[PDB]
Enzyme design. Structure first.
Site, short mmCIF file in Angstrom:
data_model
loop_
_atom_site.label_atom_id
_atom_site.label_comp_id
_atom_site.label_asym_id
_atom_site.label_seq_id
_atom_site.Cartn_x
_atom_site.Cartn_y
_atom_site.Cartn_z
CE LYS A 119 -3.78 -2.04 1.33
NZ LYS A 119 -2.89 -2.55 2.45
CG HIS A 171 11.96 6.87 -12.35
ND1 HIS A 171 13.26 6.47 -12.56
CD2 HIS A 171 11.24 6.36 -13.38
CE1 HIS A 171 13.33 5.74 -13.65
NE2 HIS A 171 12.12 5.66 -14.18
CB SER A 176 -0.65 4.90 2.63
OG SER A 176 -0.34 4.75 1.25
FE LIG Z 1 11.58 4.73 -16.10
#
Ligand SMILES: [Fe+3]
Ligand SMILES: *C1O[C@H](CO)[C@@H](O)[C@H](O)[C@H]1NC(C)=O
Ligand SMILES: *[C@@H]1O[C@H](CO)[C@@H](O)[C@H](O)[C@H]1NC(C)=O
Ligand SMILES: [Fe+3]
Length: 692
Positions: free
Chosen positions: A74, A254, A260
């Site tokens: 998560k 990226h 979380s």
């Molecule tokens: Fe990449």
């Protein structure tokens, strides 16, 4: 005093750890925030370390952001890498197909050729190219992995991280020595963007799947860059600098991920803001955050990335990835029959249990064409459509504003009985929409109450951010006062979707058992047009902000609910903007403003199919529908306005008003934009970031 032990960064190899230790001491030395290092062998191992509090953070390609966001992990992106130049910075990049100059083959003539990929499950190295090439693969679908299909398609490949034993062909070009051959690390020379490019330079492969900057990062002499071209999706070749016109996909940069749960977002961002200023793009000869010792490439972060950008709290992995790429990733594990059945099917979003029950009955009767999803707020439903998890819902114009800022579009509008101008109308579907009237309703008894003395009294609203219930009255009031302090316009209110502890929720009553107070769905008895009228009729509030037909529908035995059965139209009056008061039947000369019809919205990818389904479905369950009232009526829910308004005559076509600005109109969009300066939602913040 205080304490902050550290932020625990996960490295995925030894040269990573090395750089991570030397980052550590440079942070101590320059006195900045502390970072400590953990060592693992794979991205998956870092994703695992983080989910069990053995690490805080790791940078991941989009492919692994997807993995990281699944249960049990998560994880959430908290910071995006920024590329480009400080003049034109960007949180996206392009997946391109790079080739040598001198061949004639195009993107569709790749069969039997040899390929260089960055890595299995990576964005530019795997997901985009393989998803683009899908129709050439003759893949049967699960249970046979798509890898097997690509193993037969290219004669030889290097795909770092592939199973050398099950798919030896996918590892054949890999230049790794020993057990290092075809590994998901820098032990394998043909790994990642530069590795895949080197696989092409060496002539080991005919095609490399990389990002747009690789050729510029790795070849300094611009004459050697000329030996390379891109494969474009239109089956042409173009020079490497023309990537904007010639790419397979534009993809999210990226991102650094974190839990979380107790994620330590602030510490991570605190560390990254500081690290970037002090060791960023040529800042210190001591340490380069976005540089790698001449042995290596892209340690911890992308080489030559120029900084970080904070990801708004409402964004999960799916929202981060975008509906396109997120659903494309999922489609790699699905047959073409399953994928095409999902395209044919409309997934409705229901707000709350009551809408869910009605959507379920529709679904059962829809002959496979309609299914249901649900959430507890409208904004949460909008998010589900952005993730491609749901597709459609009818919205108040105020929410169409939010939907549009997030890139969704109006497709059909709720049409209502035409001002003594149409009949039981065969041509409802093409009859242009007329708007509805936003009114301020009060009790007749309250002889002293006017528009001019409405400030400070008690108020009933449909919900925050709705047209009649909020944007119009509060927008009119804001135009005088100038105050952004909306909770002091009225002494007490029921305005569902507001802070439960504020004065704006004081009069809300919640459900039958007193739970769900001020919740912006039908569980709150004071929610919506009917509930804001109820809030007035039961003496909770002194003014209700609703539409004219609401009073008509809920008086004179028109609604036989306990609260409503004995109410009479004559007991109610409208406040006019000139300080006069009139009967409800005179709304035409005593209204606050004209509101645009509620509209069904969707993603651009669903528009035409949504139209076919909705037109067919209303022919069966609409006002003049074949199976209504015998089996099911779409536009009926006993004054609860579930999914659609109960006075919807049909869903009608838009006549060119196919964007939110054209649909709502320039005046209304200006008004809301103004109101939103006072405070924006998480979702709007989230969408701002995603549209940049
Ligand atoms: Fe990449
Ligand atoms: C897929 O089917 C087509 C026939 O339409 C054929 O050209 C090709 O040899 C098949 N195999 C692959 C992996 O492309
Ligand atoms: C809002 O302010 C005034 C009231 O002070 C109103 O008459 C007018 O419609 C609005 N302002 C302008 C300049 O349009
Ligand atoms: Fe409305």
């Amino acid at each position: 005093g205080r304490r902050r032990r550290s932020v625990q960064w996960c490295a995925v190899s030894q040269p990573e750890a090395t750089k991570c230790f030397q980052w550590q001491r440079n942070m101590r030395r320059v006195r900045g925030p502390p970072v400590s290092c953990i060592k693992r062998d794979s991205p998956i191992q870092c994703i695992q370390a983080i989910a069990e509090n053995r690490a805080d953070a790791v940078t991941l390609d989009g492919g692994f952001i997807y993995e990281a966001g699944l249960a049990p992990y998560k994880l959430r992106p908290v910071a995006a890498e920024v590329y480009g130049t400080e003049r034109q910075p960007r949180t996206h990049y392009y997946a391109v197909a790079v080739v040598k100059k001198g061949g004639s083959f195009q993107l569709n003539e790749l069969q039997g050729l040899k390929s260089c990929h960055t890595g299995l499950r990576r964005t530019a190295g795997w997901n985009v190219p393989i998803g683009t090439l899908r129709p050439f693969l003759n893949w049967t679908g699960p249970p046979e992995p798509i890898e097997a299909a690509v193993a037969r398609f290219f004669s030889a490949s290097c795909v770092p991280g592939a199973d050398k034993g099950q798919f030896p062909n996918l590892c054949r070009l890999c230049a790794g020595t020993g057990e290092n051959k075809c590994a998901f690390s820098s032990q394998e020379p043909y790994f990642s963007y530069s590795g895949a490019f080197k696989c092409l330079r060496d002539g080991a492969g005919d095609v490399a799947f990389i990002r747009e900057s690789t050729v510029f990062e790795d070849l300094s002499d611009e004459a050697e860059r000329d030996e390379y071209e891109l494969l474009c999706p239109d089956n042409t070749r173009k020079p490497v600098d023309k990537f904007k016109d010639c790419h397979l996909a534009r993809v999210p940069s990226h991102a650094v991920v974190a839990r979380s749960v107790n994620g330590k977002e602030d510490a991570i961002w605190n560390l990254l803001r500081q690290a970037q200023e002090k060791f960023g793009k040529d800042k210190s000869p001591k340490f380069q955050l976005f540089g790698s010792p001449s042995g290596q490439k892209d340690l911890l972060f992308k080489d030559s990335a120029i900084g970080f950008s904070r990801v708004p709290p409402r964004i999960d992995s799916g929202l981060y990835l975008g509906s396109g790429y997120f659903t494309a990733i999922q489609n790699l594990r699905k047959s073409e029959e399953e994928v095409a059945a999902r395209r044919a099917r409309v997934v409705w979003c229901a707000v709350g249990e009551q809408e869910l029950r009605k959507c379920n009955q529709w679904s059962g009767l829809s002959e496979g064409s309609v299914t249901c999803s649900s959430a507890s707020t409208t904004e949460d439903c909008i998010a589900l459509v952005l993730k491609g998890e749901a597709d459609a819902m009818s919205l108040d114009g105020g929410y169409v504003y939010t939907a549009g800022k997030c890139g969704l579009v109006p497709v059909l509008a709720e049409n209502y009985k035409s001002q003594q101008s149409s009949d039981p109308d065969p041509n409802c579907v093409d009859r242009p929409v007329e708007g509805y009237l936003a009114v301020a309703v009060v009790r007749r008894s309250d002889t002293s109450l006017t528009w001019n003395s409405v400030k400070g009294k008690k108020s009933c609203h449909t919900a925050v951010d709705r047209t009649a219930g909020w944007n119009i009255p509060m927008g009119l009031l804001f135009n005088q006062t100038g105050s952004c302090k909306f909770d002091e316009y009225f002494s007490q209110s029921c305005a569902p979707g507001s802070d439960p502890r504020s004065n704006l929720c004081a009069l809300c009553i919640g459900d039958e058992q007193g739970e769900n107070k001020c919740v912006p769905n039908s569980n709150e008895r004071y929610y919506g047009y009917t509930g804001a009228f109820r809030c007035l009729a039961e003496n909770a509030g002194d003014v209700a902000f609703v539409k004219d037909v609401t009073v008509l529908q809920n008086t004179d035995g028109n609604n036989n609910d306990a609260w409503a059965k004995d109410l009479k139209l004559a007991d109610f009056a409208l406040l006019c903007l000139d300080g006069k008061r009139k009967p409800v039947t005179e709304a035409r000369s005593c209204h606050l403003a004209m509101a645009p019809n509620h509209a069904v919205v969707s993603r651009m990818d669903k528009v035409e199919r949504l139209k076919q389904v909705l037109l067919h479905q209303q022919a069966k369950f609409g006002r003049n529908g074949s199976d209504c009232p015998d089996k099911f009526c779409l536009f009926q829910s006993e004054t609860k306005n579930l999914l659609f308004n109960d006075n919807t005559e049909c869903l009608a076509r838009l006549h060119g008003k196919t964007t939110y600005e054209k649909y709502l109109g320039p005046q209304y969009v200006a008004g809301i934009t103004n109101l939103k300066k006072c405070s924006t939602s998480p979702l709007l913040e989230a969408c701002e970031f995603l549209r940049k």
